[model samples]
Target: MKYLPQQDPQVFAAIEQERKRQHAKIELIASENFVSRAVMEAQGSVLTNKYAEGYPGRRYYGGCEYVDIVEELARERAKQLFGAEHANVQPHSGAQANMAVYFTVLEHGDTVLGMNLSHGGHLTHGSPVNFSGVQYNFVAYGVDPETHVIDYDDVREKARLHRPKLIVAAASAYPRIIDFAKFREIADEVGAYLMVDMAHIAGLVAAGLHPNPVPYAHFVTTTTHKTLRGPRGGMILCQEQFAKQIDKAIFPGIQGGPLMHVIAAKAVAFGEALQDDFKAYAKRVVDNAKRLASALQNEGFTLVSGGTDNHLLLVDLRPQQLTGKTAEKVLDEVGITVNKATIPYDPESPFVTSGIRIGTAAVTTRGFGLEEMDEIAAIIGLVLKNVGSEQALEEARQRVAALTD
Candidate 1:
């Protein structure tokens, strides 16, 4: 604030607009969260000037003594937070973190098993356009049509048929808890390694509200953001046996320099995750999610999987005969932000799907509890159910104003 306005007026104005947009709208995007002030301060520190290309205490550049401490704090605290044997806090994003894991063990064109994208999986989980899918044979497993949960029987059948070298256990839009133990069992039977991408649920796992994949997975990858409430970055946790290999894969194999400043923020975020109140915050997140899902259902909207067991829920808009694109557009007009997502076995095109993804982490962080959740669902119902009525849209806008104010 001190110098940015004078240094770059146009960029500064845009940044201010974004800050106000975040404050004014309801952020229901599942992969987003607000980081603490300490995390932001650390990210804006002088550490950004450094280039620590390698791990702590062994850098390719000179004068890494101070940065060594920062990186080591991030590494050790991340290890403590997840109970993993080794931690690498240097990948630039969740995609990069996933890439490093594949680099360490997988050969080119090796077969891998992962969740189907239409059934709530991230693009890095082997989409056709992504590097993972283009370079490797990525076989997909889907959820049950009626229950909307991962079908372990199908996973086993896929593994048996494909004989994949690795099996991935994670999702971007799944509403229910994943059974990592079952994934591990299937991987064992298929003679494959298991990798769990806990990006969206890292904070819940940190609070012990969800099952920790550390005990069952050979490698765990996550973003420092999302429920972890950290800066935008990625991390990898693996057993001690693969520590050196993982490090090399991330460094000389993929990346050249580490973001030392973001690493500092990651350490701060890990420090916060270690606090007692964070556990309580995570509990409220899940509680708010369930409350919102119930409130939405009571308003005549059907939810994917019937309900949620975590911080996010997928709203099936087909029963109401609304495309996800229309719902997303109308909701944004009234100050609610959400993403259009494809439901399992979706009949609509990928660009105009039949579902919307809503999350409680960002709203819960803003202190909106169950009571507010009820109001939010009601506003959504009114807005979506009266899409062509300007009067109803104005009414919904006023309601969002009350929450923001």
Candidate 2:
């Protein structure tokens, strides 16, 4: 802070503003989390200066002995945390991790089955504008229209009909638990490889709150940021048989020159997740999300899948005949931050959907509990129910300040 403020006053001023914003506002975005001070220290260390281009002991450059230790710590800790047979902690982001897996197992024209983007899938999971959809013949599997849960029957039918070479499980906006075993079984029936993008639920899986996909899927990918609460990066886990190919896919196959500092931060975060305290923290995260969901329901909002089995809840604004855009804007004015999201079979376009995505992880990290969750829900209700009422908006803004303070 000292050196940056002195050397780059303009950038430092903006950074200071961002820091102030983070403290003053409520962060409900589902795909974000706050990393620990220790993780921050690791990421802000001298390892950033290193340029070790290969794995430990096999680096293309010299003087990699120290960074090699850091990389090994990340790799070994990741395997231990997820109970995976192999681990690759080099992909720059979750998209890169999925891209690497696709590179390893499928050809350019290969068919793949992925969750529909509107039904809670990530853009990397084969959205038409993404590279995956452009390169591969991606078919979609959807959730049930009424229940908003992944339709296993639809998955099976899609696999049988499309006969894809790979089937992906997990998603970015899904609220319920994904049955990885069922996905694996369907992949088996179709003679396809199973890959799970567990980026959103990686921390829940690490805490054993969500089922582990590593045990069932041939490949698993996750981001270290989001729920994992690490620096922004990605990792891939697979069986030992696919270990070498996965490594190559990440290295020369997709990227070169790993970010050693971020890897060190990932190792630190993994080490933290392995602790008993993290388990208790994770328990509170889910409980707070559930409390928030019910509280919102009491305010007359409909939650996708009825409620959440994990850290996030998707709110359907259709009951009030409101677009998520309206809710997101009004809520932002009241000092609470959230994102508009697409619900199952969303009637509107993705840019103007009828839902909001909310997660308690970052607020939970900031030490909020069930009580604060209820207050948040109440504030959201106040703002959404009286969008144009200055008196009510001011009251909600005051309440948001109380909670953040």
TM-score for each candidate, following the candidate numbering = 0.99, 0.99
| Candidate 1 local lDDT, 1-405, one digit each (tens) | 799999999999999999999999999999999998899999999998998898877889899999999889999999889999999999999999999999998999999999999999889888999999998899999999999999999999999999999999999999999999999999999999999999999999999999999999999999999999999999999999989999999999899898899999999999999999999999999999999999999999999999999999999999889999999999999999999999999999989999999999999999999999999999999998999999999999999999989
Over the stretch 91-175, how does candidate 2's per-residue lDDT look in tens digits?
A: 9999999999999999998999999999998999997789999999999999999899999999999999999999999999998
Error of 1 at 389 (Å): 0.9
Q: After best superposition, candidate 2 residue 172: deviation in angstroms?
A: 0.3
Name the regions of candidate 1 deviating beyond 4 angstroms: none
Local distance difference test values of all predictions, in order: 0.95, 0.94
Instruction: Tell me the deviation in Å of residue 346 in model 1.
Output: 0.6
Off by over 4 Å in 2: none
